[PDB]
Design a binder for this molecule. Structure first.
Ligand SMILES: OC[C@H]1S[C@H](O)[C@H](O)[C@@H](O)[C@@H]1O
Ligand SMILES: OC[C@H]1S[C@H](O)[C@H](O)[C@@H](O)[C@@H]1O
Ligand SMILES: OC[C@H]1S[C@H](O)[C@H](O)[C@@H](O)[C@@H]1O
Ligand SMILES: OC[C@H]1S[C@H](O)[C@H](O)[C@@H](O)[C@@H]1O
Ligand SMILES: [Mn+2]
Ligand SMILES: [Mn+2]
Ligand SMILES: [Mn+2]
Ligand SMILES: [Mn+2]
Ligand SMILES: [Mn+2]
Ligand SMILES: [Mn+2]
Ligand SMILES: [Mn+2]
Ligand SMILES: [Mn+2]
Lengths: 393, 393, 393, 393
């Protein structure tokens, strides 16, 4: 332990503010005031806080109410020093968004949702946020005949490109990040994985300022490898923000503390974020944001314990991942396994497709049966990682 | 029933040729000769046959052996009239490909794999194939430390762009299709879903001739909605080929007959392929290829029954999907649910982002509580589809 | 297809009464007066209604209020003729039940939970129910060290045996039905599948009146085969009740209309309920109960439409499943496949183990390679089922 | 951490002997002489070895060959000191077993399968095994109409009761352990989870000597909690053997090294095996058996390295899990959380149902809102476990 603001640990107001209402029961904790959240998070070592528009401003609030609320919010920020690196919009709670915001079958709900996003971009800019996150939780269906699937993507593009053009038009220093989720609350959510979100961005007019906001638990709900998924976002220059938490299996979104889900996977996620790639390449330098929910069985001391635990987990794994990579036994194990060898291009500088085909050395006279004998020693290399993770080495 | 060549039903040689060896047991049927496969498939109504290089030419074969084999193959094609619309390479059976072809940690295996693909492009062109499919089944890992994840994607890009540049250089009338699979045989396979494959293509130098080959069962192994997934491929102008089969759940790749997995989902897949989108848009016009495996408990009469059953299933659902959409009760149900309304743009012709924000009608004075009362009637609309599917209407 | 009370369709009050609140948003529908639920279900063809103590009687109800409400609900039943075949207790909604009722860590809470069940058994007895369902939704944990697992099963045993002991003591004509669910709301729920439910029942002092209430979607939440799980329950004579609905994959509990999830699986469930086993055996004769939730996107015509969709789906599957088994072609296929040879004992009349090992024909000179030649033809048999399901036969 | 025979590590011959053939490719390693397996495992610290009849003795072995092979294998055991605690039968590899052994549709095949098991029980008895495992891998179906499900369970019962009856008849000191697997190679396997395994055992004439052999990966294949499933088996006193390995999600059976799958889950499995239940109860004392497969990418140093990784992982988890429970801080946390109050009966000494309902303190005047205020602090307790696991405490 000991997180400091330099670690860039950010928390959403809704994480610690999560009161416990689930599908089978009512809240188990008292509402948390947002000024209280800020003082408490700053006491713990956080660098910043994120929020959804309705986390701070009730759906109902009048302009006078809005201003009362923002002034205390801003004072708190001032008194503590926390930044506001990311802002997001609630397009899922109110009954109006029951069929989605941007891809609602109703045109007038679509306009209302886009209106709400546009206004929220103005608050984002005013707050000093660098990222605007979009989670399309109600965009999807339970039944396959509910939507025209091409029209749904057209409507998604229209929303995102209007938002994007508005940033560009106003000159805000903001990027858009899409947050994928496979299901829940909808049976099928559109752009369900990091893959679908990356692909979708390439069809946009204003894709240059649109990237992703992957969430550990969300890719694990489709049973995918989260390190692989973030690696491809990174590789594409699209890992703009990240949500860290835990998920044990393919079930409802659990949003456990980071490291309380798939531990081995969390260790390799930390190694990619902190250390980057073994042969060198891109590095993710944004905030380490925790999108989790404090277990409903626990009271407020559990809330603050859980906020701490997210930061401890990440620093404990960071430590073990630094020792792991620095270990000369591991570096040699890596070399034997061909980790560095993957880094060499397949073709020689200047060789063409017809030049290699025609190279007798790599095809006609290649000894495939000899080449197959190679002991990659991937088990041994996995054993060294686990032993570094167990604090054994 | 009655399929004819005009239906464009294509089968891989390995489907009907699947002898039954699984991870827990030996083959239960005798090898099937490829000339026999062609006569039998042509008798049934198929339009074409696809194959992997090693399905026809043993890994070991000499040029004299290659030519003996191709001449009988080509004669059979000639005598029956079946086309060869797609060809693919085996980069997974031989022990040399145990760490992958293109993303093998060993550089010399990478060159061998690319050599093998290049040579197979020449046979593809000679056969009259329009599509060259790439399934990267051994590209991936069991453990997260096994690979440098950026280097793996670099190596994947280098392979695919060399292949692509070679087509372009030679002027073959061929496109590349990537076939996604989440896992098996590898713990984690790279580009595991339609999403990841679409995204990956956008990072290529020669992406203009690279598209996808989605497989029903493969997206269902990540628990995804296959109709949604193909809809996004289509929408992107990237649905170049398709593999149809069945899968009951998230488990090993089952490759059941099409319609013997998720039936409701198969019905909507057929509706998108045959009918396209309710508001109009792109249409998939390629071959309807069945990538399935005849159950190992069944003998050869089951093989030919199973080939028939794939075509019957697709024609039975086609029929029900045509009746469903033609039904005036359904068209009215669709209209009530806003299916057509999704097709209208959100913004009015000429309206800007600042023009709608500022439109009092869609934000400040919008009645969200009134708008939330809308009965979308999605259940009723799903009930009409199921009733058309049950042959009830 | 029109349901009559003869059909035995029963609906939970909480099903049509579902308000639409989920984890990400508020209710989309006004609360349903129970009196109105009764009258409405009676006009649709329902046979009876089921409820949870708190669905009718609020947690904090005074005795004058409790009397009133019961007066109103008995009146409605008397007017309409609806029966009340099953009653159940809410041990999940109040914040007190955050760690469970029966298996809470706090002893005072376990006593309050058992007391709440005992009172509810009186009520069940007063309404004329035959079945008392226990759904242990809060029984389990998010974390592995949270519970003493042997002690959680003793605590579950204590509560269920006390309830069972009380039933017998009072002379009520009531059986207890346990209802498995693998996860949600807890990360792991105890007795997660039909198998675990059955196994626990065998360790009970009063297991003779304790059986199962399997739910379609719940077994599909662990990827199991619903038809196989209720077949084990039938076979053990412990299928006391059933909850019919749809689930589209391993994800949050969807509670879709019966037949709106896995369609083929629904078809074979209905065949099992209607036709029983091919070679004879126990048959289920209780209520066909629907535990579903009207999608929150739908408004009140949608609620009664969804109610009605359940009974339509069941009657359509039933029509097809009777047709399927009555078909000569199907019977012939069944014969070929060995469905009726499975029913023949393996041993001969008074043949012992020793007798069989010594029989040379069965082992020593058994021709294993000739016996492996059988064409089981299970694919053709599956094709016949689907053709009956699709009403093409 | 160095294993000694005192540790009781047992390995299947088929584990280190796995050749690397999977569904998509051929073997990557030469066959392993069993004599050599024995000697090698003996030098690593193995306590004993287990095998399948056909792992040692080929299907078609003549009697002179069978004698030889057994002579060779008994010699190796005598030289090394290795015990043979469990023996099992291959009822899945020959094409004859394509529809199962015990539950095949063909009666001649069921008789041959039972005969094959009876002979194998003699052999088990001759090798000194305490346990006889039955893995019904081919028992199940791909399609729902393939089997008469009540008849499949009677057929399973018949075979298992005959085997059990024969054991008792011969006076062998042998218990039968059933091993669940939910799917693969069949689409649905009968008795798919620990729960179903336990439930079936209660319908057996000779259930007293019939218990379970749960496998880590198999329960994780249905998304269940391995620790909860073996806790139910322990509690019912039916945990006769166990198979330890790793699984990374709901997918094909991976058989990774123990600890190379779900790490936290492994940690809590080891705590259950070593520490038993927090409030006391049955303890498992059999062999710690590893049913894994050396990844096919690895060559022979990798095979012995993987063997050794199993025992290292187990010893490292064991060191941490003993430390964890010995920690005062952990004990305090456990107290707070109610882990020890779960062990207190709910009822008082001679308190009846009637007594509790009438007790006003437990119901009528129970303060539910005050009792809901308890901070169970399960998150802090989970954090302590992980900190012990990571060796940071
Ligand atoms: O704004 C992004 C938030 S929205 C919503 O609270 C959700 O459940 C989260 O997973 C996303 O991170
Ligand atoms: O070439 C594409 C083939 S390769 C391999 O036979 C595989 O299992 C399939 O799913 C793919 O469709
Ligand atoms: O007690 C029966 C009910 S309790 C609760 O409403 C639950 O979610 C259901 O699945 C059960 O069937
Ligand atoms: O009989 C024990 C073996 S049989 C077979 O090898 C299987 O795949 C395993 O999981 C079991 O543990
Ligand atoms: Mn989440
Ligand atoms: Mn998130
Ligand atoms: Mn497949
Ligand atoms: Mn395929
Ligand atoms: Mn449910
Ligand atoms: Mn239910
Ligand atoms: Mn296994
Ligand atoms: Mn096993």
């Amino acid at each position: 332990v000991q997180p400091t603001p330099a670690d860039h640990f950010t928390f959403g107001l809704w994480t610690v503010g999560w009161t416990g209402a689930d599908p089978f029961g009512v809240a188990t904790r008292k509402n948390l005031d947002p000024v209280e959240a800020v003082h408490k998070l700053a006491e713990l070592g956080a660098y910043g806080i994120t929020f959804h528009d309705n986390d701070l401003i009730p759906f109902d609030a009048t302009e006078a109410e809005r201003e009362k609320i923002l002034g205390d919010f801003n004072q708190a920020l001032k008194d503590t020093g926390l930044k506001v690196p990311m802002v997001t919009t609630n397009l899922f709670s109110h009954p109006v968004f029951k069929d989605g915001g941007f891809t609602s079958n109703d045109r007038s709900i679509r306009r209302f949702a886009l209106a709400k996003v546009l206004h929220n971009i103005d608050l984002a800019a005013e707050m000093g946020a660098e990222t605007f996150v979009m989670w399309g939780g109600r965009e999807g269906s339970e039944y396959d005949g509910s939507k025209d699937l091409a029209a749904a993507l057209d409507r998604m593009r229209e929303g995102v490109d209007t938002a994007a053009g508005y940033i560009k038009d106003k000159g805000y220093n903001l990027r858009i990040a899409l947050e994928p989720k496979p299901n829940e609350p909808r049976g099928d959510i559109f752009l369900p994985t990091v893959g679908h979100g990356l692909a979708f961005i390439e069809q946009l007019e204003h894709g240059d300022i649109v990237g992703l906001n992957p969430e550990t638990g969300h890719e694990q709900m489709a049973g995918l490898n989260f390190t692989h998924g973030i690696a491809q976002a990174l590789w594409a220059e699209k890992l703009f923000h990240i949500d860290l938490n835990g998920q044990r299996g393919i079930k409802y979104d659990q949003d456990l503390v980071f490291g309380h889900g798939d531990l081995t996977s969390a260790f390799f996620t930390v190694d990619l974020l902190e250390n980057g790639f073994p042969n060198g390449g891109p590095k993710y330098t944004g905030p380490r944001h925790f999108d989790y929910k404090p277990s409903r069985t626990d009271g407020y001391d559990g809330v603050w314990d859980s906020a701490k635990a997210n930061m401890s987990m990440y620093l404990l794994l960071k430590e073990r991942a630094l020792a792991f990579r620095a270990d000369p036994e591991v570096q040699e194990a890596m070399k034997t396994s061909g980790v560095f060898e993957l880094g060499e291009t397949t073709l020689n500088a200047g060789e063409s497709a017809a030049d290699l085909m025609n190279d007798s050395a790599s095809f006609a006279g290649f000894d495939a049966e000899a080449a197959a004998e190679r002991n990659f020693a991937f088990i041994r290399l996995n054993q060294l990682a686990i032993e570094h993770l167990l604090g054994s080495r």
